[PDB]
Symmetry: D3
Subunit: 143 residues, 6 copies
Amino acid sequence: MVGKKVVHHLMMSAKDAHYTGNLVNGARIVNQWGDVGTELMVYVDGDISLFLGYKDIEFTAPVYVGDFMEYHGWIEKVGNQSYTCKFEAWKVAKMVDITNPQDTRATACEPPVLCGTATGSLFIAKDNQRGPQESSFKDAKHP
Amino acid sequence: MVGKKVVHHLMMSAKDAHYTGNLVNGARIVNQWGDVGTELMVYVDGDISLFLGYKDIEFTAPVYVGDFMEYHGWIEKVGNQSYTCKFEAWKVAKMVDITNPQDTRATACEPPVLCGTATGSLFIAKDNQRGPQESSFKDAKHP
Amino acid sequence: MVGKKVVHHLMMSAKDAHYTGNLVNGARIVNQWGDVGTELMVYVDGDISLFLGYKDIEFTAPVYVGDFMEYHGWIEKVGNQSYTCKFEAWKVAKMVDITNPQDTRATACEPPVLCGTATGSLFIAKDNQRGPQESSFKDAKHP
Amino acid sequence: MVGKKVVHHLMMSAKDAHYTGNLVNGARIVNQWGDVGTELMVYVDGDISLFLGYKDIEFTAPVYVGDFMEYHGWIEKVGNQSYTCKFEAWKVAKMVDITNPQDTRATACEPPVLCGTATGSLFIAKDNQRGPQESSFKDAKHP
Amino acid sequence: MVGKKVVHHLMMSAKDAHYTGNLVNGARIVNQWGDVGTELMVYVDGDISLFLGYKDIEFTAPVYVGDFMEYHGWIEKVGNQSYTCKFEAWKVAKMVDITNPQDTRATACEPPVLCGTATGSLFIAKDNQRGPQESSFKDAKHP
Amino acid sequence: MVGKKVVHHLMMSAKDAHYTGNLVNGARIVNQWGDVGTELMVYVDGDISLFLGYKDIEFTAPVYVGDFMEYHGWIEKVGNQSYTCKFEAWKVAKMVDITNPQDTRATACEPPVLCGTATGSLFIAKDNQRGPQESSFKDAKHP
Ligand SMILES: [Zn+2]
Ligand SMILES: [Zn+2]
Ligand SMILES: [Zn+2]
Ligand SMILES: [Zn+2]
Ligand SMILES: [Zn+2]
Ligand SMILES: [Zn+2]
């Protein structure tokens, strides 16, 4: 790991439903990993970066309205202009019975439930790199 | 404090702009504190709860597109059916120059910048309380 | 009251649901009061202003998809740079049975149902104040 | 006119921009007229109705982020199952200079600026009509 | 027809619901026809244009979450500054039973189901017309 | 290829901006490929399916507000419960100068510009497969 792990955390609201049955789409996780990756790039080189692509996105558990979700990312390798990052998505709380809209019961997921993993790469053109911006990234070094 | 502090963390995207000039509205913070409060209520008594009101919301710094934000909340007092909570909002990263849309430079806020505080109260009817759901809340006790 | 009361009015659509059960979050009301406050500031001094904070937000009735809502605000006191405003939220129509998604019946709320109240304050820096912009605000005077 | 005029009122936020240059699309007005029409149908016959179509939508002035807008509608004719309604859209306040994102100046539109008109028709199947729900509609009568 | 028919195609997600019962509003179709019209104007004269109005919008079948929809438009007449266009909306796939949120069954609409038609007009000021931009529009000629 | 290619087509509006500078996030493409994949699954086996993951997402050109985009997908292999699909994203029109918000000029991309590719897999549990629903998929066969 280069630098600290970045952790986003938020709730799936009714606005996050995508399919019928209060089911959130897997792309919602990818949206959040894009923002996690951006934060990592701000810290390592002071630019919001451009997202190049992914490998091995795996969606491992369904996500519903009322789930509380965490999205973890970290830099695995600092390249010359490209940065290889790893990502995870975890469910930390949920409604007890999504099928009953009037049921207000909810609980924690302890341990948390793995909902996705991915490897991604981000790019900052050499002329736009500004060096580390956040103290945990100070010994980021390039090849 | 009763139980653990809950920390939401996410990015302000262009979708979070509300006013002209890429300025986010203060209500965006209140939206997030509602979800923080919900998470606390899930953990303390197993219900999503109803939000009763606030006191002393203070908005202390402007928030823009490209800001990375954290939203902290915790339970201060467990009542019979009402729960008094404290909330904070903190900026952890930002664009360098929001006034130049083509400027991709961004940096950390170290130390983080205080953007808001509030006291709020949430309600779970007695019949809907289920006891603690998350281990850090196990010694929640009522009057 | 200084100037006229501003009244926003609109419908809660399915897009306004936040929690399960077609329940709208209280923060939706705060979002609308921010826009009511902005309109008041445009009229009193010709600037969109910055929202400083609230006191005594109280949420008094639940709001659902298909509710028609009014949001009232007015200036109580013109300060030097700060303006104290009062806000209310009222339900004027609703679905008869939110628990049956196929039920299309709806009715008025006559009398209207109080859903929230608040006191808030908004700020316009002295250099940005332009004087009244709307005829009902012409005798706005500062201390 | 049958019954009272319904008036929606709200702000165009940055979220309402559609085209480049902070320009709102004309369809945003049609969205709001759909909700105005729904409210009229709730009042005249107690059902949210189905929107059948329009004639003569005319868009008469551009709408931008930061405009405050009113949307008026009323019933012109109560049919057997169809209801002919008239609609208008009016601008009541606006930013002074949309082309300068840092300019916070705004003013009223006094008199208000006409932004659109339309004639539309809505439908409630005979079996779903429940009679008037709001006192101003009490003498709604059908052919 | 002047030039080619433009065809938009997409899915109604849960985010497109507007009324209760997973029902999409007719204005969603008008939103899409605005974007179809824009594309036609880009191709015929190189400007995003301004939408002037409609005649004869007819909404002919309800649209729900999980419907796959196509939106067709074409130029019927090139005027001096105004362009008369025709529009259609077609349903190509749908959920089998919208009333059961846990039912994941879906099917095609073969033949496709007509959901709307309209005639609209768009405007490009003479000074902003740039001539055809897309090869199928090369023989666009004005009066 | 098994069955026909599915083509989604739509516009990036101001609502699709994500980063500063009117830049759309790469996750917007992944959102659309999820809906393309869903449509393919409806046609091949009559269920909306669950998205399993991706390989080799590559983002190849930036996307901005005012771009018109096409999203292509097709089934490469029908498995027992998993379906391997290929996806592409293409830009077909764009604003001439995104950096000038008042510039309304736009043009076609002829030839269209490649913005992304991916391989993905979708899942329908055996008990939920219903056979082909759309005539071009009639000779879908499983191992
Ligand atoms: Zn570096
Ligand atoms: Zn308890
Ligand atoms: Zn003044
Ligand atoms: Zn009647
Ligand atoms: Zn021409
Ligand atoms: Zn099959």
